[PDB]
Write a protein that binds this ligand. Structure first.
Ligand code: HEM
Ligand SMILES: OC[C@H]1O[C@H](O[C@H]2[C@H](O)[C@@H](O)[C@H](OCCCCCC3CCCCC3)O[C@@H]2CO)[C@H](O)[C@@H](O)[C@@H]1O
Ligand SMILES: CC1(C)[C@H]2CC[C@]1(C)CC2
Length: 461
Protein backbone atom coordinates (compact mmCIF):
# COMPACT_ATOMS: atom_id res chain seq x y z
CA UNK A 1 0.00 0.00 0.00
CA UNK A 2 3.08 2.17 -0.29
CA UNK A 3 6.13 1.92 -2.59
CA UNK A 4 7.68 -1.44 -3.34
CA UNK A 5 10.28 -2.58 -0.70
CA UNK A 6 13.97 -2.07 -1.11
CA UNK A 7 17.17 -1.02 0.55
CA UNK A 8 16.87 1.79 3.17
CA UNK A 9 18.17 5.02 1.69
CA UNK A 10 20.32 7.82 3.26
CA UNK A 11 19.29 11.43 2.82
CA UNK A 12 21.09 12.98 -0.23
CA UNK A 13 22.99 9.82 -1.18
CA UNK A 14 19.84 7.67 -1.53
CA UNK A 15 21.01 4.04 -1.92
CA UNK A 16 24.55 4.88 -3.09
CA UNK A 17 26.37 2.98 -0.38
CA UNK A 18 24.42 -0.17 -1.21
CA UNK A 19 25.29 -0.09 -4.95
CA UNK A 20 27.70 -2.32 -6.82
CA UNK A 21 30.80 -0.65 -8.19
CA UNK A 22 30.27 -2.56 -11.44
CA UNK A 23 27.30 -0.30 -12.39
CA UNK A 24 23.54 0.18 -12.17
CA UNK A 25 22.38 -3.10 -13.73
CA UNK A 26 24.66 -5.19 -11.40
CA UNK A 27 23.40 -3.14 -8.45
CA UNK A 28 19.78 -3.79 -9.37
CA UNK A 29 20.26 -7.51 -9.99
CA UNK A 30 21.79 -7.78 -6.44
CA UNK A 31 18.68 -6.00 -5.09
CA UNK A 32 16.43 -8.39 -6.96
CA UNK A 33 18.08 -11.44 -5.17
CA UNK A 34 16.90 -9.90 -1.90
CA UNK A 35 13.67 -8.14 -2.74
CA UNK A 36 12.19 -10.03 -5.67
CA UNK A 37 11.01 -8.70 -9.04
CA UNK A 38 9.39 -5.42 -7.90
CA UNK A 39 11.44 -3.09 -5.79
CA UNK A 40 12.43 0.55 -5.15
CA UNK A 41 15.84 2.04 -5.38
CA UNK A 42 16.75 5.60 -4.43
CA UNK A 43 18.97 7.00 -7.17
CA UNK A 44 20.40 10.08 -5.37
CA UNK A 45 17.36 12.23 -4.45
CA UNK A 46 14.42 10.25 -5.96
CA UNK A 47 12.87 6.71 -5.71
CA UNK A 48 12.74 4.64 -8.97
CA UNK A 49 10.69 1.44 -9.15
CA UNK A 50 12.42 -1.55 -10.85
CA UNK A 51 10.28 -4.20 -12.59
CA UNK A 52 12.08 -7.47 -13.36
CA UNK A 53 11.11 -10.62 -15.33
CA UNK A 54 8.75 -10.85 -18.26
CA UNK A 55 5.52 -11.23 -16.18
CA UNK A 56 5.94 -8.08 -14.16
CA UNK A 57 7.14 -6.03 -17.16
CA UNK A 58 4.22 -7.17 -19.38
CA UNK A 59 1.71 -6.61 -16.56
CA UNK A 60 2.94 -3.02 -16.32
CA UNK A 61 3.43 -2.10 -20.00
CA UNK A 62 0.53 -4.11 -21.52
CA UNK A 63 -2.09 -4.71 -18.82
CA UNK A 64 -1.56 -1.31 -17.25
CA UNK A 65 -0.65 0.83 -20.32
CA UNK A 66 -2.91 3.70 -18.98
CA UNK A 67 -0.52 4.23 -16.16
CA UNK A 68 2.99 2.98 -17.24
CA UNK A 69 3.26 4.68 -20.69
CA UNK A 70 5.10 7.84 -19.63
CA UNK A 71 8.67 8.52 -20.50
CA UNK A 72 11.30 9.23 -17.78
CA UNK A 73 14.57 11.25 -18.34
CA UNK A 74 18.06 10.02 -18.98
CA UNK A 75 20.04 12.56 -16.99
CA UNK A 76 23.01 12.63 -19.43
CA UNK A 77 20.79 13.81 -22.37
CA UNK A 78 17.76 15.54 -20.80
CA UNK A 79 19.51 18.94 -20.88
CA UNK A 80 19.74 18.57 -24.65
CA UNK A 81 16.34 16.98 -25.46
CA UNK A 82 14.20 18.68 -22.78
CA UNK A 83 11.12 16.68 -23.62
CA UNK A 84 11.22 17.38 -27.43
CA UNK A 85 11.15 14.60 -30.12
CA UNK A 86 9.26 11.41 -29.99
CA UNK A 87 11.64 9.50 -27.71
CA UNK A 88 11.54 11.99 -24.89
CA UNK A 89 8.09 13.44 -25.28
CA UNK A 90 5.12 12.89 -22.99
CA UNK A 91 1.40 13.56 -23.15
CA UNK A 92 -0.19 15.03 -26.25
CA UNK A 93 3.19 15.95 -27.73
CA UNK A 94 4.09 12.25 -27.69
CA UNK A 95 0.79 11.29 -29.21
CA UNK A 96 1.32 13.65 -32.14
CA UNK A 97 4.98 12.94 -32.73
CA UNK A 98 4.55 9.17 -32.30
CA UNK A 99 1.64 9.04 -34.87
CA UNK A 100 3.54 11.36 -37.24
CA UNK A 101 6.76 9.35 -37.00
CA UNK A 102 5.05 5.96 -37.47
CA UNK A 103 2.98 7.15 -40.51
CA UNK A 104 5.98 8.74 -42.19
CA UNK A 105 8.35 5.96 -41.19
CA UNK A 106 5.95 3.75 -43.20
CA UNK A 107 4.63 5.64 -46.10
CA UNK A 108 8.03 6.66 -47.38
CA UNK A 109 9.02 3.00 -46.88
CA UNK A 110 10.72 2.92 -52.49
CA UNK A 111 9.96 0.14 -50.01
CA UNK A 112 12.28 -0.16 -47.02
CA UNK A 113 13.19 -3.58 -48.23
CA UNK A 114 14.59 -2.30 -51.49
CA UNK A 115 16.56 0.48 -49.76
CA UNK A 116 18.21 -2.10 -47.39
CA UNK A 117 18.90 -4.43 -50.28
CA UNK A 118 20.57 -1.62 -52.24
CA UNK A 119 22.54 -0.52 -49.17
CA UNK A 120 23.66 -4.14 -48.67
CA UNK A 121 25.05 -4.31 -52.25
CA UNK A 122 26.96 -1.04 -51.66
CA UNK A 123 28.33 -2.58 -48.50
CA UNK A 124 29.39 -5.86 -50.25
CA UNK A 125 31.11 -3.73 -52.89
CA UNK A 126 32.91 -1.76 -50.15
CA UNK A 127 34.03 -5.00 -48.42
CA UNK A 128 35.30 -6.45 -51.75
CA UNK A 129 37.35 -3.28 -52.22
CA UNK A 130 38.85 -3.68 -48.78
CA UNK A 131 40.72 -6.73 -50.05
CA UNK A 132 40.47 -8.71 -46.78
CA UNK A 133 42.27 -5.95 -44.76
CA UNK A 134 41.78 -5.79 -40.96
CA UNK A 135 39.30 -3.20 -39.86
CA UNK A 136 37.17 -2.26 -36.86
CA UNK A 137 33.80 -2.59 -38.63
CA UNK A 138 31.95 -0.01 -36.47
CA UNK A 139 31.99 2.75 -39.12
CA UNK A 140 30.47 0.56 -41.80
CA UNK A 141 27.86 -0.91 -39.55
CA UNK A 142 26.92 2.65 -38.60
CA UNK A 143 26.95 3.81 -42.25
CA UNK A 144 24.58 1.19 -43.46
CA UNK A 145 22.03 1.58 -40.71
CA UNK A 146 22.30 5.45 -40.80
CA UNK A 147 21.79 5.32 -44.56
CA UNK A 148 18.47 3.54 -44.25
CA UNK A 149 17.12 6.23 -41.98
CA UNK A 150 18.79 8.98 -44.03
CA UNK A 151 16.94 7.79 -47.09
CA UNK A 152 13.57 8.17 -45.29
CA UNK A 153 14.39 11.41 -43.40
CA UNK A 154 16.70 13.27 -45.78
CA UNK A 155 15.77 11.64 -49.03
CA UNK A 156 19.40 10.61 -49.71
CA UNK A 157 22.25 8.32 -48.57
CA UNK A 158 25.82 9.32 -47.79
CA UNK A 159 28.99 7.77 -49.30
CA UNK A 160 31.17 5.65 -47.04
CA UNK A 161 34.16 7.84 -48.01
CA UNK A 162 32.47 11.02 -47.01
CA UNK A 163 34.60 12.45 -44.03
CA UNK A 164 31.71 14.68 -42.90
CA UNK A 165 29.27 11.75 -42.65
CA UNK A 166 31.99 9.85 -40.87
CA UNK A 167 32.39 12.72 -38.50
CA UNK A 168 28.66 12.54 -37.54
CA UNK A 169 28.90 8.73 -37.04
CA UNK A 170 31.89 9.25 -34.81
CA UNK A 171 29.74 11.57 -32.68
CA UNK A 172 26.89 8.93 -32.40
CA UNK A 173 29.45 6.30 -31.40
CA UNK A 174 31.23 8.46 -28.76
CA UNK A 175 28.02 9.82 -27.37
CA UNK A 176 26.28 6.44 -26.80
CA UNK A 177 29.53 5.27 -25.14
CA UNK A 178 29.75 8.28 -22.83
CA UNK A 179 26.08 7.98 -21.87
CA UNK A 180 26.72 4.33 -20.93
CA UNK A 181 30.04 4.98 -19.02
CA UNK A 182 30.41 4.75 -15.24
CA UNK A 183 30.29 8.59 -15.12
CA UNK A 184 27.01 8.56 -17.07
CA UNK A 185 25.54 6.12 -14.53
CA UNK A 186 26.80 8.28 -11.64
CA UNK A 187 25.26 11.33 -13.37
CA UNK A 188 21.97 9.58 -13.31
CA UNK A 189 22.14 9.56 -9.48
CA UNK A 190 23.81 12.97 -8.84
CA UNK A 191 23.17 15.24 -11.86
CA UNK A 192 21.85 17.98 -9.46
CA UNK A 193 25.42 18.21 -8.07
CA UNK A 194 27.65 16.96 -10.90
CA UNK A 195 26.23 19.26 -13.59
CA UNK A 196 28.27 22.18 -12.09
CA UNK A 197 31.61 20.49 -12.76
CA UNK A 198 33.45 19.50 -15.96
CA UNK A 199 32.50 16.10 -17.17
CA UNK A 200 31.23 13.79 -19.83
CA UNK A 201 27.72 15.35 -19.67
CA UNK A 202 29.25 18.51 -21.24
CA UNK A 203 30.91 16.46 -23.96
CA UNK A 204 27.56 14.69 -24.77
CA UNK A 205 25.72 17.98 -24.93
CA UNK A 206 28.33 19.40 -27.34
CA UNK A 207 28.25 16.29 -29.63
CA UNK A 208 24.46 16.38 -29.76
CA UNK A 209 24.51 20.11 -30.68
CA UNK A 210 27.03 19.39 -33.45
CA UNK A 211 24.73 16.74 -34.95
CA UNK A 212 21.69 19.05 -34.50
CA UNK A 213 23.51 21.91 -36.42
CA UNK A 214 23.47 19.64 -39.52
CA UNK A 215 19.78 18.82 -39.09
CA UNK A 216 18.94 22.56 -38.77
CA UNK A 217 20.77 23.30 -42.09
CA UNK A 218 19.11 20.44 -43.89
CA UNK A 219 15.72 21.69 -42.65
CA UNK A 220 16.61 25.15 -44.07
CA UNK A 221 17.57 23.64 -47.51
CA UNK A 222 14.37 21.60 -47.57
CA UNK A 223 12.30 24.67 -46.63
CA UNK A 224 13.84 26.46 -49.65
CA UNK A 225 13.27 23.73 -52.14
CA UNK A 226 9.97 22.38 -50.81
CA UNK A 227 7.18 21.57 -53.25
CA UNK A 228 3.85 21.04 -51.42
CA UNK A 229 2.55 18.86 -54.28
CA UNK A 230 5.46 16.35 -53.98
CA UNK A 231 7.13 16.03 -50.53
CA UNK A 232 10.41 14.10 -50.90
CA UNK A 233 10.89 12.66 -47.41
CA UNK A 234 9.93 12.95 -43.79
CA UNK A 235 11.32 16.49 -43.33
CA UNK A 236 9.09 17.81 -46.22
CA UNK A 237 6.05 16.06 -44.80
CA UNK A 238 6.66 17.57 -41.35
CA UNK A 239 7.12 21.08 -42.95
CA UNK A 240 3.73 20.72 -44.64
CA UNK A 241 2.10 19.91 -41.27
CA UNK A 242 3.85 22.88 -39.74
CA UNK A 243 2.35 25.07 -42.53
CA UNK A 244 -1.13 23.61 -42.03
CA UNK A 245 -1.03 24.34 -38.27
CA UNK A 246 0.76 27.71 -38.43
CA UNK A 247 -2.16 29.78 -36.98
CA UNK A 248 -1.87 27.68 -33.78
CA UNK A 249 0.88 29.08 -31.49
CA UNK A 250 0.65 25.76 -29.55
CA UNK A 251 1.15 23.43 -32.54
CA UNK A 252 3.44 20.51 -31.70
CA UNK A 253 4.78 20.84 -35.28
CA UNK A 254 7.43 23.19 -34.01
CA UNK A 255 11.02 23.74 -35.19
CA UNK A 256 12.42 22.39 -31.89
CA UNK A 257 10.30 19.20 -32.31
CA UNK A 258 11.41 19.01 -35.94
CA UNK A 259 15.11 19.17 -35.22
CA UNK A 260 15.03 16.95 -32.09
CA UNK A 261 12.51 14.48 -33.43
CA UNK A 262 14.76 14.08 -36.48
CA UNK A 263 17.86 13.72 -34.34
CA UNK A 264 15.99 11.19 -32.24
CA UNK A 265 15.06 9.04 -35.25
CA UNK A 266 18.57 9.25 -36.55
CA UNK A 267 20.36 8.41 -33.45
CA UNK A 268 18.06 5.54 -32.59
CA UNK A 269 17.95 4.39 -36.24
CA UNK A 270 21.74 4.19 -36.36
CA UNK A 271 23.38 3.34 -33.10
CA UNK A 272 21.00 0.52 -31.87
CA UNK A 273 21.20 -1.71 -34.97
CA UNK A 274 24.85 -0.80 -35.57
CA UNK A 275 25.83 -1.94 -32.01
CA UNK A 276 23.80 -5.19 -32.42
CA UNK A 277 25.76 -5.87 -35.67
CA UNK A 278 29.06 -5.14 -33.96
CA UNK A 279 28.18 -7.75 -31.23
CA UNK A 280 26.86 -10.16 -33.80
CA UNK A 281 30.14 -10.28 -35.79
CA UNK A 282 32.25 -10.52 -32.66
CA UNK A 283 30.04 -13.55 -31.71
CA UNK A 284 30.68 -15.01 -35.22
CA UNK A 285 34.43 -14.66 -34.70
CA UNK A 286 34.20 -16.49 -31.33
CA UNK A 287 31.66 -19.13 -32.63
CA UNK A 288 32.78 -19.82 -36.22
CA UNK A 289 30.79 -23.03 -36.32
CA UNK A 290 27.60 -20.96 -36.03
CA UNK A 291 28.76 -18.66 -38.93
CA UNK A 292 29.54 -21.79 -40.99
CA UNK A 293 26.11 -23.23 -40.35
CA UNK A 294 24.38 -19.98 -41.29
CA UNK A 295 26.43 -19.96 -44.43
CA UNK A 296 25.29 -23.55 -45.18
CA UNK A 297 21.69 -22.45 -44.85
CA UNK A 298 22.25 -19.38 -47.10
CA UNK A 299 23.78 -21.74 -49.80
CA UNK A 300 20.87 -24.14 -49.59
CA UNK A 301 18.05 -21.64 -49.44
CA UNK A 302 19.36 -18.60 -51.34
CA UNK A 303 22.46 -19.73 -53.27
CA UNK A 304 25.64 -17.71 -53.90
CA UNK A 305 24.29 -15.04 -56.31
CA UNK A 306 20.71 -13.92 -55.73
CA UNK A 307 20.45 -11.14 -53.13
CA UNK A 308 18.79 -12.17 -49.91
CA UNK A 309 15.18 -10.95 -49.56
CA UNK A 310 12.77 -10.78 -46.56
CA UNK A 311 10.74 -13.62 -48.06
CA UNK A 312 13.76 -15.81 -47.34
CA UNK A 313 13.21 -15.49 -43.54
CA UNK A 314 10.45 -18.10 -43.21
CA UNK A 315 12.77 -20.63 -44.94
CA UNK A 316 15.78 -19.85 -42.78
CA UNK A 317 14.96 -20.81 -39.14
CA UNK A 318 18.64 -21.34 -38.27
CA UNK A 319 19.71 -17.85 -39.41
CA UNK A 320 16.59 -16.21 -37.72
CA UNK A 321 17.43 -18.13 -34.50
CA UNK A 322 21.03 -16.88 -34.68
CA UNK A 323 19.87 -13.26 -35.04
CA UNK A 324 17.37 -13.64 -32.20
CA UNK A 325 20.13 -14.98 -30.11
CA UNK A 326 22.53 -12.17 -31.06
CA UNK A 327 19.78 -9.69 -29.89
CA UNK A 328 19.05 -11.60 -26.67
CA UNK A 329 22.75 -12.08 -25.79
CA UNK A 330 23.86 -8.59 -26.80
CA UNK A 331 21.09 -7.10 -24.51
CA UNK A 332 21.41 -3.62 -26.14
CA UNK A 333 19.41 -1.62 -23.52
CA UNK A 334 19.53 -3.76 -20.37
CA UNK A 335 17.32 -1.36 -18.41
CA UNK A 336 15.35 -0.35 -21.48
CA UNK A 337 14.48 3.40 -21.57
CA UNK A 338 13.04 4.95 -18.33
CA UNK A 339 9.29 5.20 -17.97
CA UNK A 340 7.19 7.18 -15.53
CA UNK A 341 3.75 6.38 -14.24
CA UNK A 342 1.22 8.98 -15.45
CA UNK A 343 -1.44 8.49 -12.65
CA UNK A 344 -1.48 6.95 -9.12
CA UNK A 345 -1.37 3.25 -9.86
CA UNK A 346 -1.72 0.05 -7.83
CA UNK A 347 0.70 -2.64 -8.72
CA UNK A 348 0.89 -6.04 -6.99
CA UNK A 349 -0.58 -4.40 -3.82
CA UNK A 350 1.85 -1.48 -3.89
CA UNK A 351 0.93 2.05 -4.63
CA UNK A 352 3.05 3.80 -7.15
CA UNK A 353 2.28 7.50 -7.14
CA UNK A 354 1.94 9.68 -10.24
CA UNK A 355 5.28 10.74 -11.73
CA UNK A 356 7.38 8.00 -10.14
CA UNK A 357 10.09 6.80 -12.53
CA UNK A 358 9.93 3.10 -13.51
CA UNK A 359 12.74 1.09 -15.14
CA UNK A 360 11.64 -2.12 -16.95
CA UNK A 361 14.72 -4.32 -16.56
CA UNK A 362 14.48 -5.96 -20.05
CA UNK A 363 17.78 -7.77 -19.34
CA UNK A 364 16.01 -9.97 -16.78
CA UNK A 365 13.51 -11.16 -19.41
CA UNK A 366 16.31 -11.73 -21.97
CA UNK A 367 18.19 -13.87 -19.41
CA UNK A 368 15.23 -15.66 -17.84
CA UNK A 369 16.47 -19.18 -17.03
CA UNK A 370 12.95 -20.72 -17.41
CA UNK A 371 12.80 -19.55 -21.00
CA UNK A 372 16.51 -19.95 -21.82
CA UNK A 373 18.55 -22.83 -20.37
CA UNK A 374 22.11 -21.46 -19.82
CA UNK A 375 21.04 -17.75 -20.43
CA UNK A 376 24.57 -16.44 -19.97
CA UNK A 377 25.89 -18.37 -23.02
CA UNK A 378 25.52 -17.58 -26.74
CA UNK A 379 23.51 -20.42 -28.12
CA UNK A 380 21.24 -20.25 -31.17
CA UNK A 381 19.32 -23.33 -29.94
CA UNK A 382 17.70 -20.95 -27.43
CA UNK A 383 15.48 -20.16 -30.39
CA UNK A 384 15.12 -23.60 -32.04
CA UNK A 385 12.89 -26.65 -31.19
CA UNK A 386 13.99 -30.29 -31.41
CA UNK A 387 13.13 -30.28 -35.07
CA UNK A 388 15.30 -27.25 -35.81
CA UNK A 389 12.24 -25.16 -36.47
CA UNK A 390 12.15 -21.50 -35.19
CA UNK A 391 10.87 -21.24 -31.59
CA UNK A 392 9.78 -17.68 -30.65
CA UNK A 393 9.26 -16.89 -26.98
CA UNK A 394 7.33 -14.13 -25.13
CA UNK A 395 10.51 -13.52 -23.00
CA UNK A 396 12.20 -12.09 -26.10
CA UNK A 397 11.45 -8.41 -25.52
CA UNK A 398 14.64 -6.45 -26.45
CA UNK A 399 12.30 -3.72 -28.10
CA UNK A 400 10.15 -3.52 -24.95
CA UNK A 401 6.34 -3.65 -25.04
CA UNK A 402 3.12 -1.62 -24.92
CA UNK A 403 2.58 2.03 -26.05
CA UNK A 404 6.22 3.08 -26.22
CA UNK A 405 7.42 -0.15 -27.85
CA UNK A 406 10.29 0.50 -30.25
CA UNK A 407 8.75 2.11 -33.31
CA UNK A 408 11.72 0.93 -35.42
CA UNK A 409 11.26 -2.86 -34.57
CA UNK A 410 10.25 -3.90 -38.14
CA UNK A 411 12.97 -1.87 -39.80
CA UNK A 412 15.59 -3.05 -37.31
CA UNK A 413 14.80 -6.77 -37.80
CA UNK A 414 14.80 -6.25 -41.61
CA UNK A 415 18.20 -4.64 -41.44
CA UNK A 416 19.64 -7.33 -39.21
CA UNK A 417 18.39 -10.09 -41.45
CA UNK A 418 19.34 -8.53 -44.73
CA UNK A 419 22.68 -7.18 -43.74
CA UNK A 420 23.77 -10.27 -41.75
CA UNK A 421 22.79 -12.74 -44.59
CA UNK A 422 24.12 -10.59 -47.42
CA UNK A 423 27.47 -10.25 -45.73
CA UNK A 424 27.81 -13.93 -44.84
CA UNK A 425 26.61 -14.88 -48.39
CA UNK A 426 29.64 -13.16 -49.83
CA UNK A 427 32.26 -13.35 -47.11
CA UNK A 428 33.66 -15.48 -44.30
CA UNK A 429 35.35 -13.75 -41.32
CA UNK A 430 38.77 -14.00 -39.70
CA UNK A 431 40.81 -12.14 -37.18
CA UNK A 432 44.13 -12.33 -35.29
CA UNK A 433 42.45 -13.50 -32.05
CA UNK A 434 41.75 -17.20 -31.60
CA UNK A 435 38.01 -17.95 -30.87
CA UNK A 436 38.84 -19.24 -27.31
CA UNK A 437 40.64 -15.97 -26.53
CA UNK A 438 37.90 -13.60 -27.77
CA UNK A 439 36.55 -11.70 -24.77
CA UNK A 440 32.85 -10.78 -25.05
CA UNK A 441 32.85 -8.54 -21.93
CA UNK A 442 31.26 -5.25 -22.90
CA UNK A 443 33.42 -2.14 -23.08
CA UNK A 444 30.56 -0.15 -21.45
CA UNK A 445 27.45 -1.38 -19.63
CA UNK A 446 24.97 1.35 -18.65
CA UNK A 447 21.93 2.59 -20.57
CA UNK A 448 23.58 0.78 -23.44
CA UNK A 449 25.62 -2.41 -23.48
CA UNK A 450 28.45 -1.67 -25.93
CA UNK A 451 30.85 -4.40 -27.17
CA UNK A 452 34.63 -4.01 -27.05
CA UNK A 453 36.44 -2.75 -30.18
CA UNK A 454 37.90 -5.57 -32.30
CA UNK A 455 39.56 -6.17 -35.66
CA UNK A 456 38.07 -8.31 -38.39
CA UNK A 457 38.73 -9.34 -42.01
CA UNK A 458 35.98 -10.09 -44.49
CA UNK A 459 37.30 -12.83 -46.80
CA UNK A 460 35.59 -13.26 -50.18
CA UNK A 461 34.25 -16.70 -50.75
C1 HEM B 1 18.35 -3.55 -32.55
C2 HEM B 1 17.73 -2.45 -32.91
C3 HEM B 1 16.87 -1.78 -31.78
C4 HEM B 1 16.57 -2.10 -30.50
C5 HEM B 1 17.02 -3.36 -29.63
C6 HEM B 1 15.70 -1.04 -30.00
C7 HEM B 1 15.10 -0.96 -28.73
C8 HEM B 1 14.25 0.00 -28.25
C9 HEM B 1 13.77 0.07 -26.85
C10 HEM B 1 14.08 -1.02 -25.81
C11 HEM B 1 13.09 1.21 -26.70
C12 HEM B 1 12.34 1.74 -25.43
C13 HEM B 1 10.85 1.32 -25.48
C14 HEM B 1 10.33 1.76 -24.10
O1 HEM B 1 10.30 2.98 -23.80
O2 HEM B 1 9.89 0.95 -23.28
C15 HEM B 1 13.12 1.84 -28.01
C16 HEM B 1 12.49 3.03 -28.34
C17 HEM B 1 12.55 3.66 -29.55
N1 HEM B 1 13.24 3.26 -30.70
FE1 HEM B 1 14.15 1.40 -30.89
N2 HEM B 1 15.51 -0.14 -30.96
C18 HEM B 1 16.18 -0.57 -32.09
C19 HEM B 1 16.16 0.05 -33.31
C20 HEM B 1 15.48 1.19 -33.67
C21 HEM B 1 15.37 1.72 -35.02
C22 HEM B 1 16.13 1.07 -36.24
C23 HEM B 1 14.63 2.85 -34.92
C24 HEM B 1 14.26 3.94 -36.00
C25 HEM B 1 14.08 3.55 -37.26
C26 HEM B 1 14.23 3.03 -33.51
C27 HEM B 1 13.44 4.09 -33.03
C28 HEM B 1 12.98 4.17 -31.73
C29 HEM B 1 12.13 5.23 -31.24
C30 HEM B 1 11.68 6.49 -31.99
C31 HEM B 1 11.84 4.91 -29.80
C32 HEM B 1 10.97 5.74 -28.82
C33 HEM B 1 9.57 5.15 -28.92
C34 HEM B 1 8.64 5.97 -28.03
O3 HEM B 1 9.10 6.53 -27.00
O4 HEM B 1 7.46 6.19 -28.36
N3 HEM B 1 14.75 1.96 -32.80
N4 HEM B 1 13.89 1.13 -28.88
O1 LIG C 1 25.43 24.74 -37.91
C1 LIG C 1 26.53 25.69 -37.22
C2 LIG C 1 27.72 24.77 -37.58
O2 LIG C 1 27.64 24.40 -39.00
C3 LIG C 1 28.91 24.37 -39.88
O3 LIG C 1 28.88 22.84 -40.29
C4 LIG C 1 28.79 22.02 -41.29
C5 LIG C 1 30.01 21.37 -42.10
O4 LIG C 1 30.76 22.40 -42.76
C6 LIG C 1 29.58 20.41 -42.99
O5 LIG C 1 30.75 19.90 -43.56
C7 LIG C 1 28.76 19.31 -42.21
O6 LIG C 1 28.49 18.15 -43.02
C8 LIG C 1 27.75 17.05 -42.45
C9 LIG C 1 27.31 16.19 -43.63
C10 LIG C 1 26.91 14.78 -43.18
C11 LIG C 1 25.60 14.77 -42.35
C12 LIG C 1 25.48 13.41 -41.62
C13 LIG C 1 24.10 13.19 -40.94
C14 LIG C 1 23.88 11.67 -40.54
C15 LIG C 1 22.66 11.36 -39.65
C16 LIG C 1 22.47 12.35 -38.49
C17 LIG C 1 22.68 13.87 -38.84
C18 LIG C 1 23.99 14.13 -39.69
O7 LIG C 1 27.90 19.69 -41.13
C19 LIG C 1 27.93 21.00 -40.43
C20 LIG C 1 26.50 21.66 -40.14
O8 LIG C 1 25.86 22.23 -41.29
C21 LIG C 1 30.15 23.78 -39.02
O9 LIG C 1 30.46 22.61 -38.79
C22 LIG C 1 30.31 24.47 -37.61
O10 LIG C 1 30.86 25.79 -37.43
C23 LIG C 1 28.98 25.20 -37.03
O11 LIG C 1 29.00 24.82 -35.53
C1 LIG D 1 19.18 8.28 -26.27
C2 LIG D 1 19.60 6.87 -26.69
C3 LIG D 1 20.96 6.46 -26.13
C4 LIG D 1 19.53 6.69 -28.18
C5 LIG D 1 19.77 5.18 -28.30
C6 LIG D 1 19.08 4.60 -27.05
C7 LIG D 1 18.54 5.86 -26.39
C8 LIG D 1 18.24 5.68 -24.90
C9 LIG D 1 17.35 6.38 -27.19
C10 LIG D 1 18.05 6.95 -28.43
Amino acid sequence: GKLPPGPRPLPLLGNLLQMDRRGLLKSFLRFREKYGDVFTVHLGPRPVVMLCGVEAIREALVDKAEAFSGRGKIAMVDPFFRGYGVIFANGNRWKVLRRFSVTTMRDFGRSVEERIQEEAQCLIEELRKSKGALMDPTFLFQSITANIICSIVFGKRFHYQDQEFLKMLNLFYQTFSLISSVFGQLFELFSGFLKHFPGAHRQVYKNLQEINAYIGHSVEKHRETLDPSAPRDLIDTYLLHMEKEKSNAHSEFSHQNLNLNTLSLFFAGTETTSTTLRYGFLLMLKYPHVAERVYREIEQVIGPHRPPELHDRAKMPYTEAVIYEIQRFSDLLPMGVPHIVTQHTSFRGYIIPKDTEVFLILSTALHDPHYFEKPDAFNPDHFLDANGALKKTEAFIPFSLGKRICLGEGIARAELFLFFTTILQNFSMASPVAPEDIDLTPQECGVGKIPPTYQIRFLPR
